[PDB]
Design a protein around this ligand. Structure first.
Ligand SMILES: Nc1ncnc2c1ncn2[C@@H]1O[C@H](COP(=O)(O)OP(=O)(O)O)[C@@H](O)[C@H]1O
Ligand SMILES: Nc1ncnc2c1ncn2[C@@H]1O[C@H](COP(=O)(O)OP(=O)(O)O)[C@@H](O)[C@H]1O
Ligand SMILES: Nc1ncnc2c1ncn2[C@@H]1O[C@H](COP(=O)(O)OP(=O)(O)O)[C@@H](O)[C@H]1O
Lengths: 427, 435, 86, 417
């Protein structure tokens, strides 16, 4: 519950209507109807997943809400669909090539819902009488509507001895493997032992004696390749990034078995999204790889964001729009974000204030909207926070003009920093 | 060993109750607006409401940016963690730059985890009161309870524990006369060792005899452990327990610091939230002071202005000393403070003006005081004058050598002659430029 | 029932031995005389007393050493059950 | 007899010859000239010895061959941990510049740790269930527990063995039997060497001081410690294990007196080759509490800083120049040159005539000083070839004609291959 509000916490989805009509202000967003409708339609395409290898480029001036609309789409997509957010400079690893990192990122945003039929027996253990030779045992499971006694085997008795199960424990035994899983207790333990005090759990299902076809959908991403590349996979799946596995017999074989599962009804493919923020940092080799990697059937939807116009492509000398080669730039379609006006800026500032739980006068809102239209929006939020803190220190109830104007001089913007920078501190 | 560091006089921002700035601000002098901004941002940190916020301590060299940084750090107190980092440390040959930055961000975040355990200890006097066989079945011999006579230094208290634990008692060498470590819920017995009262001087053995427990048998030990999120990340990263990990050749290369985002985020964050909302731990976000931020590559700034966008990112205090300079890793891309113009928009710039000659004199005097050497009025005036001529940091470095010269010359206080001689024996770079 | 529950009497707290030559907490045990001691002088005096004893049937007198205020017993009857050195 | 260390490039200087009042003499401990630089070296040496402050760096400037490295080696010999390195040593393939520089900084600091433990040692007479430990002045019987019984068997302890056992059941069989060696006429085991029986009280407490540098982070780095202490060791050196554990433990030991730190000196010869990253790291590293006294040497004036196109004095950033006390050396004169040549000849066991010394000084003034320092031994060997007892002008002239100098070498490069 203790998680602080970040720069994109004010947004909590992409405000859209039944007909995908964008709204002025909803779900923490304001203005920018065109790019928001583009986000809505690409999100509909993602949730459809019928087509693979689609790319979208979010372009615009800084502070136009590129990362904002990206996080909004991520939120609107909701759980059950992977959304791999990554920065352009994260692919540069000292233990795995750029192409390998891109393959990892692509396969990481693809999920397979594996269906598994289970048969679990549950109930209340009324009698767990076990005859230890130092071989024979019987279990008396009880439910709210029926009871049954089961003769325990040697291995089952040993498993029960492993996980201590006293009378009155709510357990869920899997008839397939016999794994002992304790859920709780139905009553106290004799009220006499001067220890082991806990709370009592609710009774089990009436038909819990034998659940026939308990369906559990195990969801896992296509990053499962780490499970095969090495005999010990937890080390690679948890921390180790040195996963330069062999592409042959791993990628192709896993894809083939995933197709077999999809055809045989075991699992279903759920393509996610790969959001590369500041994609301009990718080397030209990474762009050349994305050009071809984006053509596979397992290719997720590649959302990208650029904050530049004509700029040199990293790893070469010639320039291209958005710092992306002409090929990949032409392949994808671009979503331009128009700057926000004064009203939109004021509304965004008000939404941020509401998020931060801070209140300020109308004149404060006006002067702060002015300052934000002049300097920037993020700087306006910084001033919101600073003025709220100055007001709290001042013992006031709401932020007045005298606090925003004070923190404006206390904290400087880059435009004024460079102005006072004429002291030639260093070069 | 006091081991006075370069600048240890700073003890805090020294702001008045009203939040304004004063001269004798707990060691640090001057820099009114800068110290007020430091107070605002430390109040922010204490609030623990905002995350991923960065501040830039831009200012010419010698303005004491690191000084005020350590001041605000001390003001925060040892309670919240403070991880100092320099831009050069990001360049690692084994782990990528962005992952080092993320590890530093994690270190900057603290987490106090409490743990209360009810345990019983004392000299055991085992005895099983015979009880009629299970009344539900036939007859014979059974045991319905097992009484353990735990004897502690304060007294004795018999515990009628559950009979199922008898297996644990027989498992370990729990004989009458030894100290056992009982657990309330688990019940597992862990023998600490025999009592020292039986440790005859003629018995040769160690780690087997332990003193009697002091206090009541029932002890509710409350312990708190403060570990940063990076500590938990590292702990959950590497394995432990068998699995042929004892190998030397193929395993001694422990530096596998490489880390993935799935483990870093996700499960660890969820378990932390579970411990928080359950009452087992309390999150404590700290601060990440990054001096020489201009030394980072553009591949580092492009990841910084994305990590700062996360809700979990802690407060970062950048301190750039250079001016308009080409960004590292870029082809003649000049930007203010050596930082891309895109990141400067996300940081609050705290400007620090140059110290007034009077402030130079105050700094020299307080540094001499901290060093513990008396300086005459004329010597202090000469030190202030030379600190006005050249860089101020040169004067403070002339105290200890001048002090030693004075002590060797037979005098206690640093006379003007001593500083005059040291200025000719040692000089600054501005004068050394005359090649 | 007896195996899993060896109901034995308490460990019978041992004796706090003391050096007979200096009356301090005994730190060692002379092998040949089988009497505790704490210093080298005590060991030498104990060896001399044992030699004097084994010389005849039984030493009529008793060696005296470091007699405190109260009458020191000069303990001869501190029987050493150990036999000859070798 | 020839040994590992012998007459070298800086062996003539036995130390930083100075008076009680830090008054540099003309030439006492082999070193001559550079009076102001010598007094500065003595002042910084007294500062190091005091250990009252931390994070102080001194830059030794001057033209090539002005005795900068000589003054540094003299201070090191007069100075007790000392770590001398070069700008290229910190550059490691498996360790980043920052990691190597931090390792050097921590290795430049010493730490003394006092250890006091109870020890029981004596010749074993016979075992069993019980031990019969004998010493020169007494003998004692000890009852053996399960752990002691297991240790008596895992290690083949037997009669006559001079055993040693402290607390924590840490038994040791340092060496074998004393008298029984007789019947082992022909063969004697590798580990079964013999020792004299101990004396005194059987059980005795021994206080020993362990001297280790602050670089012990490698010891607490991995599961195995002694292995990494010989070769490069670990490369990671996680910041946590370094600061949150070792520094706090050293502080606690200082508080309780268990340990005491002794700040040494870190001499980085030819610091001009360092990268801007190393300088930026030093800017902060010199601000830490447990920071040693740093010494540097550079022959560069207005030169480019490696890693960037910027130029600054001494080839290093201005940010660091404001943190160093520059001690510039002065080129030697005729008298100083002749005196250092005399010292070199006396140290190398070379005898030369007055005219030979005059010609050698004239050469060392027209050319570099090291050239004449080498001509010394060259003419000595020429005289030995001629079987003469003293080196004359003819020998030094023949050598000057045989071996060329930088100036004459460049002048004779007209061939251009
Ligand atoms: N539509 C919007 N609604 C609310 N805040 C916005 C919007 N657009 C931009 N911002 C704010 O501007 C700052 C930077 O803009 P961002 O959302 O990152 O877009 P961009 O990626 O173009 O900078 C952020 O702090 C963000 O909160
Ligand atoms: N206001 C001040 N009062 C006292 N000493 C100061 C002050 N400002 C700077 N100093 C001194 O300046 C020295 C270093 O300053 P620092 O924080 O490193 O600035 P920079 O990093 O820009 O060089 C410190 O040793 C400190 O003693
Ligand atoms: N004052 C001096 N006393 C003794 N030897 C000296 C003196 N000055 C220079 N030398 C000799 O000069 C030689 C080379 O000088 P060097 O130390 O390389 O100069 P730099 O300090 O510029 O590196 C050394 O072998 C040293 O013996």
């Amino acid at each position: 519950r203790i998680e602080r509000i970040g720069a994109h916490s004010h947004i909590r989805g992409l405000g859209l209507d039944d007909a995908l009509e964008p709204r002025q202000a909803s779900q923490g967003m304001v203005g920018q109807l065109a790019a928001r409708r583009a986000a809505g339609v690409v999100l509909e395409m993602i949730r459809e997943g019928k087509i693979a290898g689609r790319a979208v480029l979010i372009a615009g001036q800084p502070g136009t809400g590129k990362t904002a609309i990206a996080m909004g789409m991520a939120q609107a997509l909701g759980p059950d669909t992977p959304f791999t957010a990554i920065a352009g400079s994260e692919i540069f690893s000292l233990e795995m090539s750029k192409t390998e990192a891109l393959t990892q990122a692509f396969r990481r945003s693809i999920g397979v819902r594996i269906k598994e039929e289970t048969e679990i027996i549950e109930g209340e253990v009324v009698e767990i009488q076990i005859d230890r030779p130092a071989k024979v045992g019987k279990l008396t499971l009880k439910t709210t509507e029926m009871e049954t006694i089961y003769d325990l085997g040697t291995k089952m008795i040993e498993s029960l001895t492993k996980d201590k199960v006293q009378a009155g424990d709510v357990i869920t035994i899997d008839k397939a493997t016999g794994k002992i899983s304790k859920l709780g207790r139905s009553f106290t333990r004799a009220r006499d032992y001067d220890a082991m005090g806990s709370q009592t759990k609710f009774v089990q299902c009436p038909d819990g004696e034998l659940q026939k076809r308990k369906e559990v959908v195990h969801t896992v991403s296509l990053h499962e390749i780490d499970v095969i590349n090495s005999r010990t996979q937890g080390f690679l799946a948890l921390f180790s990034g040195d996963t330069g596995e062999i592409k042959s017999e791993v990628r192709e074989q896993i894809n083939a078995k995933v197709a077999e599962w999809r055809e045989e009804g075991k699992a279903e493919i759920i393509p996610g999204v790969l959001f590369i923020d500041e994609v301009h940092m990718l080397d030209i080799e990474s762009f050349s790889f994305l050009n071809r990697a984006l053509e596979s059937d397992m290719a997720p939807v590649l959302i990208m964001a650029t904050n530049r116009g004509i700029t040199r492509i990293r790893g070469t000398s010639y320039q291209s729009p958005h710092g992306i080669p002409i090929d990949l730039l032409d392949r994808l379609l671009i979503v331009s974000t128009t700057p926000y006006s004064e009203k939109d800026t004021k509304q965004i500032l008000r939404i941020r204030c509401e998020e931060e739980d801070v209140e300020m006068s109308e004149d404060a809102y006006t002067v702060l909207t002015r300052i934000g239209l002049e300097t920037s929006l993020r700087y306006a939020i910084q001033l919101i926070t600073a003025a709220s803190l100055v007001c709290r220190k001042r013992k006031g109830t709401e932020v007045q003009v005298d606090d925003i104007k004070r923190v404006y001089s206390l904290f400087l913007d880059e435009s004024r920093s460079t102005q006072y920078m004429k002291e030639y501190q260093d070069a | 060993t006091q081991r006075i560091a370069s600048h240890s006089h700073v003890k805090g921002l020294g702001l008045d109750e009203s939040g304004l700035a004063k001269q004798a601000a707990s060691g640090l002098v001057g820099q009114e607006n800068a110290r007020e901004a430091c107070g605002v941002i430390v109040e922010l940190i204490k609030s623990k409401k905002m995350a991923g916020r960065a501040v830039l301590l831009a200012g010419p060299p010698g303005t004491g940016k690191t000084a005020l940084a350590l001041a605000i750090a001390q003001e925060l107190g040892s309670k919240v963690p403070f991880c100092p980092m320099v831009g050069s440390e990001v360049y690692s040959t084994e782990i990528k730059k962005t992952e080092v930055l993320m590890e530093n961000f994690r270190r900057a975040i603290g987490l106090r985890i409490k743990e209360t355990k009810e345990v019983y200890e004392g000299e055991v006097t085992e005895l099983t009161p015979c009880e009629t066989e299970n009344p539900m079945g036939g007859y014979g011999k059974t045991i319905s309870h097992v009484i353990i006579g735990l004897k502690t230094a304060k007294g004795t208290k018999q515990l009628k524990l559950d009979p199922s634990i008898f297996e644990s008692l027989q498992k370990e060498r729990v004989e009458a006369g030894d100290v056992i470590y009982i657990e309330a819920n688990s019940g597992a017995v862990k023998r600490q060792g025999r009592c020292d009262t039986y440790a005859t001087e003629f018995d040769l053995e160690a780690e087997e005899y332990v003193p009697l427990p002091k206090g009541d048998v029932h002890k509710k030990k409350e312990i708190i452990q403060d570990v940063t999120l990076h500590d938990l990340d590292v702990a959950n990263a590497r394995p432990q327990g068998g699995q042929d990990i004892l190998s030397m050749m193929g395993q001694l290369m422990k530096p596998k610091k490489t880390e993935i985002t799935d483990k870093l985020r996700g499960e660890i964050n969820k378990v932390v939230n579970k411990y928080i909302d359950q009452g087992i731990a309390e999150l404590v976000p700290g601060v990440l002071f990054v001096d020489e931020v201009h030394m980072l590559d553009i591949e580092c700034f492009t990841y910084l202005h994305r990590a700062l966008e996360s809700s979990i990112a802690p407060i970062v205090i950048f301190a750039s000393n250079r001016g308009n300079c080409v960004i590292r890793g870029t082809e003649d891309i000049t930007s203010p403070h050596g930082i891309p113009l895109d990141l400067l928009d996300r940081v609050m710039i705290i400007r620090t003006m140059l110290y007034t000659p009077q402030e130079m004199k105050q700094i020299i005097k307080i540094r001499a005081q901290t060093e513990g050497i008396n300086i005459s009025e004329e010597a202090l005036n000469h030190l202030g004058e030379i600190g006005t001529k050249t860089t101020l940091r040169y004067s403070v470095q002339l105290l200890t050598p001048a002090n030693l010269l004075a002590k060797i010359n037979g005098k206690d206080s640093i006379e003007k002659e001593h500083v005059e001689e040291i200025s000719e024996l040692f000089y600054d770079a501005k004068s050394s430029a005359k090649i | 029932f007896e195996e899993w529950f060896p109901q034995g009497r308490p460990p019978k707290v041992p004796v706090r031995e003391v050096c007979p030559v200096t009356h301090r907490p005994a730190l060692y045990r002379d092998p040949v005389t089988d009497i505790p001691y704490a210093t080298a002088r005590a060991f030498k005096i104990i060896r001399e007393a044992y030699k004097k004893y084994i010389t005849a049937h039984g030493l009529p007198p008793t060696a005296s050493a470091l007699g405190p205020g109260p009458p020191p017993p000069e303990p001869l009857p501190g029987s050493g059950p150990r036999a000859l050195r070798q």
